[PDB]
Amino acid sequence: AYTTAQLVTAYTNANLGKAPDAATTLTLDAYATQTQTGGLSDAAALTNTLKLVNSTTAVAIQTYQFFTGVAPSAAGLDFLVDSTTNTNDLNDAYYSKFAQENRFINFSINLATGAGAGATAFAAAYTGVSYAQTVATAYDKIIGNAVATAAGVDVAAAVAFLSRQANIDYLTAFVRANTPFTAAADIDLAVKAALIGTILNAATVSGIGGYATATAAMINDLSDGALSTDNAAGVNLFTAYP
Amino acid sequence: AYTTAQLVTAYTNANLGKAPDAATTLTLDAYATQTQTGGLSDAAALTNTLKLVNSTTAVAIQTYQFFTGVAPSAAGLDFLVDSTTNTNDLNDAYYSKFAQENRFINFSINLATGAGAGATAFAAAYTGVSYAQTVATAYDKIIGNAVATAAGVDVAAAVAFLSRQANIDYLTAFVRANTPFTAAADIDLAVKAALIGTILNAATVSGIGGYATATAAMINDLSDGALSTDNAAGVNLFTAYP
Amino acid sequence: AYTTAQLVTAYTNANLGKAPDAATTLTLDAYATQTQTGGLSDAAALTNTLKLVNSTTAVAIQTYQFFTGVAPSAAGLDFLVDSTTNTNDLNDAYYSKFAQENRFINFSINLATGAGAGATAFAAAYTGVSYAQTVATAYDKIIGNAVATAAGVDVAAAVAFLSRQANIDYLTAFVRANTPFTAAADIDLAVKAALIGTILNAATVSGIGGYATATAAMINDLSDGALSTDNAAGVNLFTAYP
Amino acid sequence: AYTTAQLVTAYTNANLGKAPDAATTLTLDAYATQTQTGGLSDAAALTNTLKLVNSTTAVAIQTYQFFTGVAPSAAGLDFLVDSTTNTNDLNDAYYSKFAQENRFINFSINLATGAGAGATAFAAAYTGVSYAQTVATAYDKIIGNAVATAAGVDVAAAVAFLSRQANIDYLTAFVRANTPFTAAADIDLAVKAALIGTILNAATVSGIGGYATATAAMINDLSDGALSTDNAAGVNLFTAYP
Amino acid sequence: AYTTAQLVTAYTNANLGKAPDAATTLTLDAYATQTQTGGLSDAAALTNTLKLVNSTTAVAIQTYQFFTGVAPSAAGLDFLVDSTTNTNDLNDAYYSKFAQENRFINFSINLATGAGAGATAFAAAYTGVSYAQTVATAYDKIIGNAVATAAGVDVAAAVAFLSRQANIDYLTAFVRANTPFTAAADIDLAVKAALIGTILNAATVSGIGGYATATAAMINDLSDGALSTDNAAGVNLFTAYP
Amino acid sequence: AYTTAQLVTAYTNANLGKAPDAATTLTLDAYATQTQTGGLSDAAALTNTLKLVNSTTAVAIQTYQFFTGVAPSAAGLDFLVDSTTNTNDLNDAYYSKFAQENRFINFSINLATGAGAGATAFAAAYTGVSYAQTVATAYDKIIGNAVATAAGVDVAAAVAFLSRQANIDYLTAFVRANTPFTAAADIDLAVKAALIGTILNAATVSGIGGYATATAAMINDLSDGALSTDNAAGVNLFTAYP
Ligand SMILES: CC(=O)N[C@H]1[C@H](O)[C@H](O)[C@@H](O[C@@H]2[C@H](O)[C@H](O[C@@H]3[C@H](O)[C@@H](O[C@@H]4[C@H](O)[C@@H](O[C@@H]5[C@H](O)[C@H](O[C@@H]6[C@H](O)[C@@H](O)O[C@H](C)[C@H]6NC(C)=O)O[C@H](CO)[C@H]5O)O[C@H](C)[C@H]4NC(C)=O)O[C@H](C)[C@H]3NC(C)=O)O[C@H](CO)[C@H]2O)O[C@@H]1C
Ligand SMILES: CC(=O)N[C@H]1[C@H](O)[C@H](O)[C@@H](O[C@@H]2[C@H](O)[C@H](O[C@@H]3[C@H](O)[C@@H](O[C@@H]4[C@H](O)[C@@H](O[C@@H]5[C@H](O)[C@H](O[C@@H]6[C@H](O)[C@@H](O)O[C@H](C)[C@H]6NC(C)=O)O[C@H](CO)[C@H]5O)O[C@H](C)[C@H]4NC(C)=O)O[C@H](C)[C@H]3NC(C)=O)O[C@H](CO)[C@H]2O)O[C@@H]1C
Ligand SMILES: CC(=O)N[C@H]1[C@H](O)[C@H](O)[C@@H](O[C@@H]2[C@H](O)[C@H](O[C@@H]3[C@H](O)[C@@H](O[C@@H]4[C@H](O)[C@@H](O[C@@H]5[C@H](O)[C@H](O[C@@H]6[C@H](O)[C@@H](O)O[C@H](C)[C@H]6NC(C)=O)O[C@H](CO)[C@H]5O)O[C@H](C)[C@H]4NC(C)=O)O[C@H](C)[C@H]3NC(C)=O)O[C@H](CO)[C@H]2O)O[C@@H]1C
Ligand SMILES: CC(=O)N[C@H]1[C@H](O)[C@H](O)[C@@H](O[C@@H]2[C@H](O)[C@H](O[C@@H]3[C@H](O)[C@@H](O[C@@H]4[C@H](O)[C@@H](O[C@@H]5[C@H](O)[C@H](O[C@@H]6[C@H](O)[C@@H](O)O[C@H](C)[C@H]6NC(C)=O)O[C@H](CO)[C@H]5O)O[C@H](C)[C@H]4NC(C)=O)O[C@H](C)[C@H]3NC(C)=O)O[C@H](CO)[C@H]2O)O[C@@H]1C
Ligand SMILES: CC(=O)N[C@H]1[C@H](O)[C@H](O)[C@@H](O[C@@H]2[C@H](O)[C@H](O[C@@H]3[C@H](O)[C@@H](O[C@@H]4[C@H](O)[C@@H](O[C@@H]5[C@H](O)[C@H](O[C@@H]6[C@H](O)[C@@H](O)O[C@H](C)[C@H]6NC(C)=O)O[C@H](CO)[C@H]5O)O[C@H](C)[C@H]4NC(C)=O)O[C@H](C)[C@H]3NC(C)=O)O[C@H](CO)[C@H]2O)O[C@@H]1C
Ligand SMILES: CC(=O)N[C@H]1[C@H](O)[C@H](O)[C@@H](O[C@@H]2[C@H](O)[C@H](O[C@@H]3[C@H](O)[C@@H](O[C@@H]4[C@H](O)[C@@H](O[C@@H]5[C@H](O)[C@H](O[C@@H]6[C@H](O)[C@@H](O)O[C@H](C)[C@H]6NC(C)=O)O[C@H](CO)[C@H]5O)O[C@H](C)[C@H]4NC(C)=O)O[C@H](C)[C@H]3NC(C)=O)O[C@H](CO)[C@H]2O)O[C@@H]1C
Ligand SMILES: CC(=O)N[C@H]1[C@H](O)[C@H](O)[C@@H](O[C@@H]2[C@H](O)[C@H](O[C@@H]3[C@H](O)[C@@H](O[C@@H]4[C@H](O)[C@@H](O[C@@H]5[C@H](O)[C@H](O[C@@H]6[C@H](O)[C@@H](O)O[C@H](C)[C@H]6NC(C)=O)O[C@H](CO)[C@H]5O)O[C@H](C)[C@H]4NC(C)=O)O[C@H](C)[C@H]3NC(C)=O)O[C@H](CO)[C@H]2O)O[C@@H]1C
Ligand SMILES: [Ca+2]
Ligand SMILES: [Ca+2]
Ligand SMILES: [Ca+2]
Ligand SMILES: [Ca+2]
Ligand SMILES: [Ca+2]
Ligand SMILES: [Ca+2]
Ligand SMILES: [Ca+2]
Ligand SMILES: [Ca+2]
Ligand SMILES: [Ca+2]
Ligand SMILES: [Ca+2]
Ligand SMILES: [Ca+2]
Ligand SMILES: [Ca+2]
Ligand SMILES: [Ca+2]
Ligand SMILES: [Ca+2]
Ligand SMILES: [Ca+2]
Ligand SMILES: [Ca+2]
Ligand SMILES: [Ca+2]
Ligand SMILES: [Ca+2]
């Protein structure tokens, strides 16, 4: 049985010191009532509670792991999500106008293009590759073909939907109108990051794939208040939480 | 085997001293015959007998528990349902023109708006929340998403039906024409109580959810004549009947 | 193996001394042949043999039990069905123009209206009750909601069919044109008896319900020639044959 | 393994000394080959061999059993089917123009009307009975309602088909144009025999019912050459072959 | 594992010294490869290898067995299929223009009409029999009604298809234009042989029936090079290979 | 768990010293990630890794085995796929314009026509055989009728599709416009090689058949770097890898 005070504290640690909104408080309150009435197990309530921090914390963990090869530390997560020194962070008015999918795309573009840490690695490996191939390889890397088929979703339809011309046209307009890029090569590279960022958003929403499971464990690890690993140079998701 | 005299006495205690109507007497008489003919078990007949007091007793128990956080005592139930000092109570001519759903809405509006005990708590928590969010959170709090899916009903369709624009338009007309409220904020808060009151009526009619099960046990506890707990400050449903 | 002589004697005792008709004799003869050829068990043949006395004996037993609260005795059954002192009885030319359903309605009207034994009790309990409620309560009392659903028949459709406006219009015309009643209250009470009488006919035709099972046992008890209980003041079906 | 010589001898005894036709010889020869090739068991071949004598021997056995109450003896069967003293018998040119169904009707009319042995018994029992009732009772007596439903055939459809107005119109034309009867009562009685005769033909063709099973055993008993019972006054099928 | 040299030698013995054609050699070569790759068992390859000799050897065995009552010997098979003294045999240019079905019909006509060994027996038994009866009896004799139903094919449809007016019109044209017969009786008898010959072709193509199984064993017996029985007066298929 | 360095080395040995392309590197990288995240077993990743060398290595192994009767050695594979002395090999700019199916056809034409090693054997066996027969025999030889049916694919539809007139018209145009052949016999022989080459491409794409399984084992054997057999005169696939 979870009290509403316990759930909001777990959410606060997962959200890194940010108090829940009034609407989210009612959702957390509903979860607490279900546990007391025998309608929801203790483990299920916590997982649902930690599922509300997807747009604010899971975006920071997953984008760094794919691009920079390592997830940010507790101090790095604190700076990115909710910090006093960072005026523009994930849960402030600067990002308040974005959705979950747009937030994933923004970090993907920033990391792979310009002054991002993984920008040089992204350009070397993702050059000379078509849009369809990038989607196909990223989908297998993030979610996986075997795992997705076992879960029930159709891989062939999902890959085609993500690589449709409508998605490409919208993303290239998003890159050109927003990013300070105008060359064909620079725009082409940035669209690839946007395509990958969409896949990352799809994986965390559905919860299927190695990336989605790994970031869930890290959020659960951070839920109690202190990260168990908390490595200074970053936490490798795949080896910290096998 | 239940005699018709036993069933009406159980109903009278559940209805708090009110004699059954002539139509309800035939329904109770039919239940007694089925038990004697081996067509209905003793436990099933009593549960069906206590299912006829939904509009007169279960409304008082459930509305107080959700809003004030505690169910009324035996003396409090007596005053609300059938008392000599209370000229206008649930089973008199004042409420004789209402249906089951309208009765649930009336207590919800009275408790959450004006001089209700839980009015101050309701305003603090349910401010800045949209209509769709209030329905979604209340449905999970009262009935529950996991329990409803297991029972067979579709949660997604049920929530959309309860939050349709037709329901909102009818409820806001009900609030404005009946309640002494004219400000946008006051009307908006009252409609939220009406939306929650509809959910409470849905839960007790279908019998799915923690609230429906809890109020059934309290009515069964009151059926014999004396409430087992009968706390002076109120009976907490979720801890008295786990 | 049942001989045709044995079957007609069992039918005669069930019909209370009335010899079977020529058409019914062939039906009884067919049952005897099936037992000798190994196509029908001994118990099944007797039950089918006793199923042909529904319109002449089961009508007397069931109507008295529902209205007067007790089934007629062996002497009472003899007077009602086939007696020398009673010029107008069930199996004579006076009732030869009626069907099974009409026979059930006639006793229901006679008992509940006028000089019937149960007329005073029927008026006290069945006053202020709508037609739909009377059908719903009688159907549960006679057949039962749980038993009917288990058997496979749809209760919701059956109740609506029995309470349709076409049935009410036919029955009120039957009451007004036949019974010596013209007041609204007297006609309304008589139609309720007709509605109940139709339900009794439905129960005995289909064989589902406590009433149908109980009257079958009494007919089987009377089949051998002498009733086992044969109480002077009447036989209570539900306690004599649990 | 049955040789073609053995099969024709079994058929000859079943047909009471009549040699098989050239077409029937090929059918018997085909049965013999199947047994030698392992495609048909010995018991199945004999039953199929004895199924070809339906129109010549099973008609004599079944009609007498239903009407006269006893099957003909071996000498009686010999006179009826194939005898030197009887110029007009079942397997001669006199009956060579009839089919299986017409042969059954002819004996039914002869036995129940005119100088038949069972004519007086048939008139006493089958007077005052409608056509539909006669078909319904005869079908239960010969085939049976329970047995037919278990086999898979629909009793309700079969009875209605046998009692259709087209069947009655054809049969009454058959009776009037052929039998020397013109009165309404005499024609009505003869049509009842024709209706029963059709049922007997249906039972032996399909092989369902006590009559069909009983006459099959008697033919099998006669197959070896000598009847085991061979009672002088007739063989009662239901007690000789339980 | 079968080598391509072994398969062609088995086919040569089955074909009685005739070397396989170039097209058939590839088919035999494909069977050998499948056994070496673990895609086909040794027994299955030999049965498929012996299934290619249907039009040249199984025609001689089956037609003699049905008509003359005995299959030809090894010397008789050698003369009929592939012999130096016989200029016109089954696998030469004389029969190179015929198909499998036409080859079966040719032997049936030759044996049952003219100077055939079984011509006198065929005329005595198959006189006075209609076309439909001949097809029905031959189908039961060759394939069998019980065996065909167990295999899954519909006997009623198959018999009607083989006895359709289109088949009769084609066969009677085949008989009249080819055979030196012009009388009605002679043509009628020859068409019956053609109808039976078609059934024999159907049985060996599908592989269902006692005849098809028996001739397969004899071909398998001849496959090694020397027939095990090799009776001088002929081999009776049904007793040599039970 | 496979590292991306291990997968590319396995692919390099399978591709015989050729470094993977940038697009293929991402595919190999995705396989490595899945193994580390527990979404793909070690054996499955290697098989998928070796499935990307179908167009460059499996074409050399399979075409030689079918036509020349033996697969090329490690030195022979090195010369054909990736060698310094061979300016025009499978993975250079000379073959960079072809697809997988066209590559299979090219070797089939070269080997069976002109100066190919198996040209003389192909002409001797595949002369006087129709197009439909060649497809039917090759399909059974390469994939097999029994194996294909067990896998689920329809053999009858597949053979008809491969032998359709549209396929023949395209292939004969391919032969005439490309190969230096103009005679009817030479073109006819070359089209047969093209038809077989298409079947080989179909077998390796679907992975069904003895040829597909055998060439997979040889590629797996070559994956570690050194071939286990490495016979100087060639490796017989069916006996080296049973
Ligand atoms: C392992 C670990 O724990 N490491 C930590 C360290 O130990 C240490 O504690 C600390 O570090 C930080 C961190 O590494 C930081 O990384 C940044 C960061 O990931 C990210 O930052 C953003 C960037 O500085 C910048 O913004 C603009 C802006 O997004 C703009 O986009 C427009 C615009 O918003 C408006 O017009 O709306 C449009 C729709 C929008 N367009 C799009 C496409 O979205 O776009 C431009 C061009 O893309 C972009 O430059 O400002 C943001 C506010 C900022 N975000 C946050 C949350 O702060 O990406 C950087 C590339 C990345 N830098 C490097 C280097 O990798 O870097 C600082 C140093 O600069 C470091 O101290 O934290 C570690 C995690
Ligand atoms: C724990 C426990 O056991 N406690 C008990 C105590 O120990 C003690 O024994 C005792 O207490 C009572 C009780 O707490 C009472 O609580 C009241 C009560 O819940 C409720 O009361 C109603 C209210 O006083 C009032 O009415 C009007 C009216 O409903 C009107 O609505 C119109 C109108 O009917 C007509 O026009 O038709 C329209 C369709 C209708 N509109 C709508 C929208 O329905 O609407 C106005 C505005 O909403 C409303 O004020 O009169 C009712 C007759 C009355 N109902 C009953 C059953 O009595 O709500 C009050 C807000 C609530 N008060 C407080 C405070 O919470 O309060 C009294 C003291 O006043 C107390 O003694 O019982 C405890 C249970
Ligand atoms: C426990 C036990 O065993 N008790 C027995 C006693 O110990 C004792 O042995 C003995 O008793 C009898 C019995 O109690 C009797 O009961 C009667 C009886 O149940 C019933 O009787 C009928 C009634 O007297 C009457 O008839 C008319 C008539 O039905 C008429 O209807 C018209 C008409 O037929 C024509 O126009 O066609 C129309 C279509 C039709 N209309 C309708 C609607 O059908 O309608 C009027 C008004 O309804 C009606 O009065 O005459 C009938 C012939 C008679 N039936 C039989 C079978 O006899 O109902 C009585 C109300 C009931 N009486 C009492 C009192 O309850 O009563 C006598 C004394 O009168 C008693 O000796 O048997 C016990 C079973
Ligand atoms: C256990 C359960 O749940 N059962 C239910 C079923 O599962 C099902 O859901 C529904 O099914 C029904 C049910 O089986 C039913 O049966 C009918 C019914 O019993 C009755 O129905 C009445 C009838 O159609 C009709 O009657 C007239 C009338 O009897 C008339 O007689 C006159 C008249 O009384 C007066 O003038 O006096 C005269 C002397 C008299 N003449 C006589 C007696 O000769 O005679 C005519 C024929 O000439 C007759 O049509 O109309 C009534 C309104 C109707 N009543 C109701 C309540 O509907 O009798 C039918 C013979 C009977 N049918 C069959 C078949 O048995 O059947 C329907 C058929 O669709 C079925 O759907 O409900 C169950 C409760
Ligand atoms: C127990 C036992 O074993 N008993 C045996 C005895 O011990 C003893 O061995 C011995 O007995 C016989 C037997 O009992 C016989 O029984 C006969 C017999 O069952 C049957 O006989 C037929 C009857 O005599 C008669 O014919 C005409 C004819 O059918 C005609 O019909 C016309 C006509 O054919 C033409 O116009 O075509 C029309 C389409 C056709 N119409 C129809 C409707 O079909 O119709 C008339 C009127 O119906 C009819 O009389 O002649 C037949 C040739 C004959 N059939 C045979 C097979 O012989 O029915 C008799 C009524 C019955 N008699 C008695 C008595 O029951 O009787 C003799 C004595 O007469 C007896 O020796 O065998 C015992 C079995
Ligand atoms: C048990 C055993 O092993 N016995 C063997 C012996 O021990 C001994 O070793 C030896 O015997 C042979 C064998 O018994 C032979 O039997 C023959 C044989 O079965 C068969 O022979 C055919 C017949 O002689 C004949 O031909 C014509 C021709 O078919 C013609 O048809 C035309 C024509 O082809 C053209 O116009 O095209 C048309 C489409 C075609 N029409 C049709 C309808 O097809 O039709 C006429 C009339 O039907 C026909 O006579 O010539 C054939 C070439 C020949 N076939 C072969 C394969 O040789 O049928 C004979 C009736 C049969 N004879 C007897 C007798 O039964 O007989 C010789 C002696 O003549 C004997 O030495 O082999 C035993 C098996
Ligand atoms: C068991 C083992 O390991 N053996 C090895 C040896 O031990 C030894 O190590 C070594 O041997 C080689 C090898 O045996 C070689 O075999 C060749 C080879 O299989 C193949 O070679 C091709 C051929 O020489 C040739 O080309 C043209 C060309 O393809 C042309 O096609 C046109 C053209 O490309 C353009 O116009 O586009 C068109 C679309 C196209 N048309 C079509 C239809 O595709 O077509 C003509 C006519 O078909 C053709 O001649 O040149 C190619 C570049 C070459 N391919 C490669 C990969 O090198 O087929 C030869 C017939 C075969 N030779 C013999 C002999 O069998 O032979 C050399 C000696 O010449 C030997 O040293 O390797 C062993 C495996
Ligand atoms: Ca913080
Ligand atoms: Ca901040
Ligand atoms: Ca932790
Ligand atoms: Ca009270
Ligand atoms: Ca009151
Ligand atoms: Ca209690
Ligand atoms: Ca009597
Ligand atoms: Ca009387
Ligand atoms: Ca008794
Ligand atoms: Ca005889
Ligand atoms: Ca005779
Ligand atoms: Ca016997
Ligand atoms: Ca030879
Ligand atoms: Ca020859
Ligand atoms: Ca052998
Ligand atoms: Ca190399
Ligand atoms: Ca090269
Ligand atoms: Ca190796």
Author numbering:
A (entry chain F), B (entry chain A), C (entry chain B), D (entry chain C), E (entry chain D), F (entry chain E): 2 to 243
Sentences from the paper on this structure:
We present a new approach for macromolecular structure determination from multiple particles in electron cryo-tomography (cryo-ET) data sets. Whereas existing subtomogram averaging approaches are based on 3D data models, we propose to optimise a regularised likelihood target that approximates a function of the 2D experimental images. We illustrate for three applications that our approaches allow structure determination from cryo-ET data to resolutions sufficient for de novo atomic modelling.
We also applied our approach to thin cellular appendages of C. crescentus bacteria known as stalks, which have previously been imaged using cryo-ET. The cell body and cell stalks of C. crescentus cells are covered by a nearly hexagonal, paracrystalline array known as the surface layer (S-layer). The structure of the S-layer was solved using a combination of X-ray crystallography, cryo-EM single-particle analysis, and subtomogram averaging, revealing how the S-layer is attached to bacterial cells by an abundant glycolipid called lipopolysaccharide (LPS). Next, we defined a mask around the central pore of the S-layer, corresponding to the inner domain bound to LPS, to perform focused refinements. Accounting for per-particle motions with additional cycles of pseudo-subtomogram improvements and refinements increased the resolution of the central pore to 4.0 Å, and the inner domain of the S-layer to 3.7 Å. Further 3D classification without alignments identified a subset of 42,990 subtomograms that gave a 3.5 Å resolution reconstruction of the inner S-layer. The 3.5 Å map is in excellent agreement with the single-particle structure of the in vitro reconstituted complex, including the LPS binding site. Furthermore, divalent metal ions, known to be tightly bound to the inner S-layer, are resolved. Surprisingly, at lower isosurface contour levels, we also observed a second LPS binding site. The size and shape of this density agree with the structure of the LPS O-antigen, illustrating how improved subtomogram averaging in RELION-4.0 can help uncover new biology.
